[PDB]
């Protein structure tokens, strides 16, 4: 898929899914395509993780428009099943959004991974 | 009546009227001074 342009390599996926898992435990994370779109419209999203093997790809390809329109970093990971396991819900999630909070224990990791994604863009 | 005075609410056109406005502020200042 060339439409999934920024696709993470292995180590980048590992870092991203670890940050997603910590953000889910702290509950700084919003799961699902519609909930991620709502966070983006609210302007409270830190950054966007999407799946790549979603069936099909357009139903979340609607997101990069809003993503760089409000200038939010976004990334694609290969497996929506991996994304669901990392989010910590029993169903495969195709798009998750780390929100913004600075009274948060994982601010440093969030900023590191967001910087690395932005460099990949 | 007019078109630029036709307002969608009877309270809106009442406070849009002006002689009522000066009468209302006059009598309200009177009764407020009487209250205090």
């Amino acid at each position: 898929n060339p439409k999934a342009f920024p696709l993470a390599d292995a180590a980048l996926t590992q870092q991203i899914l670890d940050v997603v898992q910590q953000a889910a435990n702290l509950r700084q994370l919003k799961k699902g395509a519609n909930e991620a779109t709502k966070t983006l419209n609210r302007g409270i999203s830190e950054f966007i993780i999407m799946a790549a093997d979603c069936e099909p790809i357009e139903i979340l390809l609607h997101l990069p428009l809003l993503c760089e329109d409000k200038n939010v970093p976004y990334v694609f990971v290969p497996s929506r099943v991996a994304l669901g396991r990392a989010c910590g819900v029993s169903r495969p999630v195709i798009a998750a959004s780390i929100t913004t909070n600075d009274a948060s224990a994982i601010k440093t990791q969030i900023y590191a991974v967001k910087d690395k994604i932005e460099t990949l863009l | 009546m007019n078109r630029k005075e036709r307002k969608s609410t009877i309270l809106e056109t009442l406070m849009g009227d002006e002689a009522s406005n000066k009468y209302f502020k006059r009598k309200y200042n009177e009764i407020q001074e009487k209250s205090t």
Binding site: N25, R27, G88, S90 | -
Partner: protein
């Protein structure tokens, strides 16, 4: 008293109104303008008045650094006192919008935290030595 829906509505109202105000407003520039001069003697004899062929007010202002050949506010009532007052009124209106918006954000965040702590999990109430209360969900995949 009120609800998260009402606070969310008011926050989006004020955010869009502040955006329209910032679109209508005007910000004066502050940049590091450089001029690239060929020879060192011209560098030594450079002066902005001659380089831009303006006057002193026209060179210390940056918007209209008009040509002197181009040169070759008293229409409204109370120019020195009312117009600047109205412009400062617009600026303070945008500022009041911004502070009311962030106060609504704080109220919304506290209401959201209360709603989640009411909502769900296996939580332990942890206190931090700055006195601050958090709730720790145990790691458990919610089904």
């Amino acid at each position: 008293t009120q609800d998260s829906n009402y606070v969310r509505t008011l926050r989006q109202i004020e955010l869009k109104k502040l955006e329209k105000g910032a679109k209508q407003l005007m910000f004066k520039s502050s940049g590091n303008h450089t001029i690239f001069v060929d020879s060192r003697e011209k560098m030594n004899e450079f002066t902005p008045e001659k380089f831009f062929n303006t006057t002193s007010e026209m060179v210390n202002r940056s918007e209209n650094r008009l040509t002197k050949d181009q040169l070759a506010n008293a229409s409204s009532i109370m120019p020195k006192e009312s117009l600047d007052k109205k412009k400062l009124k617009k600026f303070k209106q945008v500022k009041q919008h911004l502070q009311r918006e962030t106060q609504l954000k704080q109220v919304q965040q506290r209401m959201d935290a209360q709603r989640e702590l009411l909502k769900k999990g296996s939580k332990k109430k942890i206190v931090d030595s700055s006195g601050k209360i958090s709730f720790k969900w145990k790691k458990q995949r919610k089904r």
